[PDB]
């Protein structure tokens, strides 16, 4: 059932695309056809210049992707220069003091951390998606 | 309320987080538990101004080096921790806590801190200073130190009896304003 969201979900995203990691190794979309998919929600992606970027976030095993909508397609996200697909090894979450609706995410990695900011709809949503992500991040191996 | 971004620093286990949680809660920790990224968010009057302050901890452990600089963008004011009884956390900040805020964010005010101010006094912890063959920290070396690097203040304080703490924070804003 959320395997069925999660293949059509893989049909909409473009053949083509891809996201540098930090240690530049490329990650293409080949290698997501294996998945499991957990969550799946509409959230906004602050910028460094405080702008929001719409994005879908899915959270998976074993990894945590980030997306956005070319015309009727989906593609992996390319904000800030920063990887659209974060492993969970060693991810971690703490919530925005400046707003409730927000958390941090910071994705530890072989070439280095890297943060992201996200903003949801509520602070029912952003509490959710913190203990959902603190979860898979438990189960991950 | 104008909106100013504090970012703490310091060698591991100086008192930083009990510093910041004790500033903004009134109440001193629970256990240790060291930090790897926690933010906070205060509102205090300072001069008659309504100020948003944000405060941002960070890991004191070299583990974190990498880690650290991430919350450095677009700080308005950075916090240079010592302990009064751990002299080498205080040799640290010319060695590696002033040179780190000048790499990442030159041109940004810093107040050095003392922290761990009640421990200076307590004989108890003297003595265990005098085993190490260590002497706590006197207030005219931080003041020579903050000159030292260039920095606004020289504040002393300590989260346990929070003497001198508000005035940590209050200067900190006025180096802002
Ligand atoms: N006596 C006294 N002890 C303090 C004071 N502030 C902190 N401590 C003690 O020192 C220890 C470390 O304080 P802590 O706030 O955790 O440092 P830290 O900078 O956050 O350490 P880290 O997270 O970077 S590793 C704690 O066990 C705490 O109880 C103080 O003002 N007086
Ligand atoms: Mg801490």
Same mark, same amino acid.
């Given at each position: ?16 695309? #891809?996201? @540098?990691?930090?240690? &530049? ?5 080949? !290698? +997501?056809?294996?998945?499991?998919? %957990?969550?799946?929600?509409?959230? #906004?992606? @602050?910028?460094?210049? &405080? ?5 879908? !976030? +899915?959270?998976?095993?074993?990894? %945590? ?77 | ?177």
């Amino acid at each position: 059932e959320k395997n069925q969201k999660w293949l059509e979900i893989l049909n909409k995203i473009e053949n083509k695309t #891809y996201t @540098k990691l930090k240690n &530049g190794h490329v990650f293409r979309k080949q !290698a +997501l056809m294996e998945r499991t998919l %957990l969550y799946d929600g509409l959230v #906004y992606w @602050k910028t460094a210049t &405080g702008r929001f970027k719409d994005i879908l !976030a +899915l959270l998976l095993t074993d990894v %945590l992707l980030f997306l956005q909508e070319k015309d009727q397609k989906y593609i992996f996200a390319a904000v800030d220069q920063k990887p659209s697909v974060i492993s969970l090894q060693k991810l971690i979450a703490r919530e925005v003091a400046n707003e409730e609706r927000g958390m941090f995410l910071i994705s530890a990695s072989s070439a280095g951390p890297e943060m992201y900011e996200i903003h949801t709809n509520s602070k029912e949503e952003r509490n959710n998606w913190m203990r959902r992500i603190q979860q898979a991040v438990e189960s991950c191996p | 309320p104008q909106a100013i971004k504090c970012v703490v620093v310091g060698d591991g286990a100086v008192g930083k987080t009990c510093l910041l949680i004790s500033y903004t809660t009134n109440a001193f920790p629970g256990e240790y538990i060291p930090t790897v990224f926690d933010n906070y968010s205060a509102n205090v009057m300072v001069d008659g101004k309504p100020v948003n302050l944000g405060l941002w901890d960070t890991a004191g452990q070299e583990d974190y080096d990498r880690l650290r600089p991430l919350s450095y963008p677009q700080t308005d004011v950075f916090l240079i921790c010592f302990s009064l009884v751990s002299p080498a956390s205080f040799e640290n900040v010319r060695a590696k806590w002033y040179p780190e805020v000048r790499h990442h964010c030159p041109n940004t005010p810093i107040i050095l801190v003392g922290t761990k101010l009640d421990l200076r006094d307590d004989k108890d912890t003297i003595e265990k200073l005098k085993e190490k063959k260590l002497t706590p920290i006197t207030y005219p070396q931080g003041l020579a130190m903050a000159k030292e690097i260039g920095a606004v203040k020289y504040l002393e304080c300590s989260a346990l009896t929070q003497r001198g703490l508000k005035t940590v924070f209050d200067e900190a804003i006025r180096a802002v304003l």
